[PDB]
Coordinates of N, CA and C in Angstrom, one line a residue:
Chain M
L1 N -32.2 -144.1 22.7 CA -33.4 -144.6 23.3 C -33.3 -146.1 23.6
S2 N -33.6 -146.4 24.9 CA -33.6 -147.8 25.2 C -34.9 -148.5 24.6
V3 N -34.9 -149.8 24.8 CA -36.1 -150.5 24.4 C -37.3 -150.0 25.1
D4 N -37.2 -149.8 26.4 CA -38.4 -149.4 27.2 C -38.8 -148.0 26.8
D5 N -37.8 -147.1 26.4 CA -38.1 -145.8 26.0 C -38.9 -145.8 24.6
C6 N -38.5 -146.6 23.7 CA -39.2 -146.9 22.5 C -40.7 -147.4 22.7
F7 N -40.8 -148.3 23.7 CA -42.1 -148.8 24.1 C -43.0 -147.6 24.6
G8 N -42.5 -146.7 25.5 CA -43.2 -145.6 26.0 C -43.6 -144.6 24.8
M9 N -42.7 -144.5 23.8 CA -43.0 -143.6 22.7 C -44.2 -144.2 21.9
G10 N -44.2 -145.6 21.7 CA -45.3 -146.2 21.0 C -46.6 -146.2 21.7
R11 N -46.5 -146.3 23.0 CA -47.7 -146.3 23.9 C -48.3 -144.9 23.8
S12 N -47.4 -143.8 23.9 CA -47.9 -142.4 23.8 C -48.6 -142.2 22.5
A13 N -48.0 -142.6 21.3 CA -48.6 -142.6 20.0 C -50.0 -143.3 20.0
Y14 N -50.1 -144.5 20.6 CA -51.3 -145.2 20.6 C -52.4 -144.4 21.4
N15 N -52.0 -143.9 22.5 CA -53.0 -143.2 23.4 C -53.6 -141.9 22.7
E16 N -52.9 -141.4 21.6 CA -53.4 -140.3 20.8 C -54.1 -140.8 19.6
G17 N -54.2 -142.1 19.3 CA -54.9 -142.6 18.1 C -54.0 -142.5 16.8
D18 N -52.6 -142.3 17.0 CA -51.7 -142.4 15.9 C -51.2 -143.8 15.8
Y19 N -52.0 -144.6 15.1 CA -51.7 -146.0 15.0 C -50.5 -146.3 14.1
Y20 N -50.4 -145.5 13.0 CA -49.2 -145.6 12.1 C -47.9 -145.5 12.9
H21 N -47.8 -144.5 13.7 CA -46.6 -144.3 14.5 C -46.5 -145.4 15.7
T22 N -47.6 -145.9 16.2 CA -47.6 -147.0 17.1 C -46.8 -148.2 16.5
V23 N -47.2 -148.4 15.2 CA -46.6 -149.6 14.5 C -45.1 -149.4 14.4
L24 N -44.7 -148.2 14.0 CA -43.2 -148.0 13.8 C -42.5 -148.2 15.1
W25 N -43.0 -147.6 16.2 CA -42.3 -147.8 17.5 C -42.3 -149.2 17.9
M26 N -43.4 -149.9 17.8 CA -43.6 -151.2 18.4 C -42.7 -152.2 17.5
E27 N -42.7 -152.0 16.2 CA -41.8 -152.8 15.4 C -40.3 -152.7 15.8
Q28 N -39.9 -151.4 16.2 CA -38.6 -151.2 16.7 C -38.3 -152.0 18.0
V29 N -39.3 -151.9 18.9 CA -39.2 -152.6 20.2 C -39.1 -154.1 20.0
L30 N -40.0 -154.7 19.1 CA -40.1 -156.1 18.9 C -38.8 -156.6 18.2
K31 N -38.2 -155.8 17.3 CA -36.9 -156.1 16.7 C -35.9 -156.3 17.8
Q32 N -35.8 -155.4 18.8 CA -34.8 -155.4 19.8 C -35.0 -156.5 20.8
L33 N -36.3 -156.8 21.3 CA -36.6 -157.9 22.0 C -36.3 -159.2 21.3
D34 N -36.6 -159.4 20.0 CA -36.4 -160.6 19.3 C -34.9 -160.8 19.1
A35 N -34.1 -159.7 19.0 CA -32.6 -159.8 19.0 C -32.0 -160.1 20.3
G36 N -32.8 -160.2 21.4 CA -32.3 -160.7 22.7 C -32.0 -159.6 23.7
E37 N -32.3 -158.3 23.4 CA -32.0 -157.2 24.3 C -32.9 -157.3 25.5
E38 N -32.4 -156.8 26.7 CA -33.1 -156.9 27.9 C -33.9 -155.6 28.1
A39 N -35.0 -155.7 28.8 CA -35.9 -154.7 29.0 C -36.9 -155.2 30.0
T40 N -37.7 -154.3 30.6 CA -38.8 -154.7 31.4 C -40.0 -155.0 30.5
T41 N -40.1 -154.3 29.3 CA -41.2 -154.6 28.4 C -41.1 -156.1 28.0
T42 N -42.3 -156.7 27.8 CA -42.3 -158.1 27.3 C -42.8 -158.1 25.9
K43 N -42.6 -159.2 25.2 CA -43.0 -159.4 23.8 C -44.6 -159.4 23.8
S44 N -45.2 -160.0 24.8 CA -46.7 -159.9 24.9 C -47.2 -158.5 24.9
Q45 N -46.6 -157.6 25.7 CA -47.1 -156.2 25.7 C -46.9 -155.6 24.4
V46 N -45.8 -155.7 23.7 CA -45.6 -155.1 22.4 C -46.6 -155.7 21.4
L47 N -46.7 -157.0 21.3 CA -47.7 -157.6 20.4 C -49.1 -157.1 20.6
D48 N -49.5 -156.8 21.8 CA -50.9 -156.4 22.1 C -51.2 -155.0 21.4
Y49 N -50.2 -154.1 21.6 CA -50.3 -152.8 20.9 C -50.2 -152.9 19.4
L50 N -49.2 -153.7 19.0 CA -48.8 -153.8 17.6 C -50.0 -154.4 16.8
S51 N -50.6 -155.5 17.3 CA -51.7 -156.2 16.6 C -52.9 -155.2 16.3
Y52 N -53.3 -154.5 17.4 CA -54.4 -153.6 17.3 C -54.1 -152.4 16.3
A53 N -52.9 -151.9 16.4 CA -52.5 -150.8 15.6 C -52.5 -151.2 14.1
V54 N -51.9 -152.3 13.8 CA -51.9 -152.9 12.5 C -53.3 -153.0 11.9
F55 N -54.2 -153.6 12.7 CA -55.6 -153.7 12.3 C -56.2 -152.4 12.0
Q56 N -55.9 -151.3 12.8 CA -56.4 -150.0 12.5 C -55.8 -149.4 11.2
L57 N -54.6 -149.8 10.7 CA -54.2 -149.5 9.4 C -54.9 -150.2 8.3
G58 N -55.7 -151.2 8.6 CA -56.5 -152.0 7.6 C -55.9 -153.3 7.3
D59 N -54.9 -153.8 8.0 CA -54.2 -155.1 7.6 C -54.7 -156.2 8.5
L60 N -55.8 -156.9 8.1 CA -56.3 -158.0 8.8 C -55.3 -159.2 8.9
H61 N -54.7 -159.6 7.8 CA -53.9 -160.8 7.8 C -52.7 -160.6 8.8
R62 N -52.1 -159.4 8.8 CA -50.9 -159.2 9.7 C -51.4 -159.1 11.1
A63 N -52.6 -158.4 11.3 CA -53.1 -158.3 12.7 C -53.4 -159.7 13.3
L64 N -53.9 -160.6 12.4 CA -54.2 -162.0 12.8 C -52.9 -162.8 13.2
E65 N -51.9 -162.6 12.3 CA -50.6 -163.3 12.6 C -50.0 -162.8 13.9
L66 N -50.1 -161.5 14.2 CA -49.6 -160.9 15.4 C -50.4 -161.4 16.6
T67 N -51.7 -161.5 16.5 CA -52.6 -161.9 17.6 C -52.3 -163.4 17.9
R68 N -52.1 -164.2 16.9 CA -51.8 -165.6 17.1 C -50.4 -165.7 17.9
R69 N -49.4 -164.9 17.5 CA -48.2 -165.0 18.2 C -48.4 -164.6 19.7
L70 N -49.2 -163.5 19.9 CA -49.5 -163.0 21.2 C -50.1 -164.1 22.0
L71 N -51.1 -164.8 21.5 CA -51.7 -165.9 22.2 C -50.8 -167.0 22.5
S72 N -49.9 -167.4 21.6 CA -48.9 -168.4 21.8 C -48.1 -168.1 23.0
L73 N -47.7 -166.8 23.3 CA -46.9 -166.4 24.4 C -47.7 -166.0 25.6
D74 N -49.0 -165.9 25.5 CA -49.8 -165.3 26.5 C -51.2 -165.9 26.5
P75 N -51.4 -167.2 26.7 CA -52.7 -167.9 26.5 C -53.8 -167.4 27.3
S76 N -53.6 -166.8 28.5 CA -54.6 -166.3 29.4 C -54.8 -164.8 29.1
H77 N -54.3 -164.2 28.0 CA -54.4 -162.8 27.7 C -55.9 -162.6 27.4
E78 N -56.5 -161.8 28.2 CA -58.0 -161.6 28.1 C -58.4 -161.3 26.7
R79 N -57.9 -160.2 26.2 CA -58.4 -159.7 24.9 C -57.8 -160.4 23.7
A80 N -56.6 -161.1 23.8 CA -56.1 -161.7 22.6 C -57.0 -162.8 22.1
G81 N -57.6 -163.6 23.0 CA -58.5 -164.7 22.6 C -59.7 -164.2 21.8
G82 N -60.4 -163.1 22.4 CA -61.5 -162.5 21.8 C -61.2 -161.9 20.4
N83 N -60.0 -161.3 20.3 CA -59.5 -160.6 19.1 C -59.3 -161.7 18.0
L84 N -58.7 -162.8 18.4 CA -58.4 -163.9 17.5 C -59.7 -164.4 16.9
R85 N -60.8 -164.5 17.7 CA -62.1 -165.0 17.3 C -62.7 -164.0 16.3
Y86 N -62.7 -162.7 16.6 CA -63.1 -161.6 15.8 C -62.4 -161.6 14.4
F87 N -61.1 -161.6 14.5 CA -60.3 -161.6 13.2 C -60.6 -162.8 12.4
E88 N -60.6 -164.0 13.0 CA -60.9 -165.3 12.3 C -62.3 -165.2 11.6
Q89 N -63.3 -164.6 12.2 CA -64.6 -164.3 11.7 C -64.4 -163.4 10.4
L90 N -63.7 -162.3 10.5 CA -63.5 -161.4 9.3 C -62.9 -162.2 8.2
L91 N -61.9 -163.1 8.5 CA -61.2 -163.9 7.5 C -62.2 -164.8 6.7
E92 N -63.2 -165.4 7.4 CA -64.2 -166.3 6.8 C -65.1 -165.4 5.8
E93 N -65.3 -164.2 6.1 CA -66.2 -163.3 5.3 C -65.6 -162.9 4.0
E94 N -64.2 -162.6 4.0 CA -63.5 -162.6 2.7 C -63.3 -164.0 2.2
Chain O
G1 N -65.4 -154.4 16.5 CA -64.0 -154.3 16.3 C -63.2 -155.1 17.4
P2 N -61.9 -155.2 17.3 CA -61.1 -155.8 18.3 C -61.0 -155.0 19.6
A3 N -60.6 -155.5 20.7 CA -60.3 -154.7 21.9 C -58.8 -154.5 22.0
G4 N -58.3 -153.3 22.0 CA -56.9 -152.9 22.2 C -56.6 -152.7 23.7
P5 N -55.3 -152.4 24.0 CA -54.8 -152.1 25.3 C -55.5 -150.9 25.9
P6 N -55.7 -150.8 27.3 CA -56.4 -149.7 27.9 C -55.6 -148.4 27.6
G7 N -54.3 -148.4 27.8 CA -53.6 -147.2 28.2 C -52.2 -147.2 27.7

């Protein structure tokens, strides 16, 4: 499986509401991107799926860390800014 | 909740 094929696997998982498997696939993609492998998939795309999926597993702190990374690499990302605000709000409540 | 990717 190429990086892009792993991405398509994770996207397929996500589209079915299987967030646990989305995380596994997207962590594999992100590992390969961060190791410098070439693909058409971008780190921003992977982080967008990965952050949301992690939050669905119940992990706010990790979802926030991933969203901050996403925003660092993609400041005009529509949803990442709104998500960051939402997650930061949840963090103040705990 | 957060907004995730469309598709």
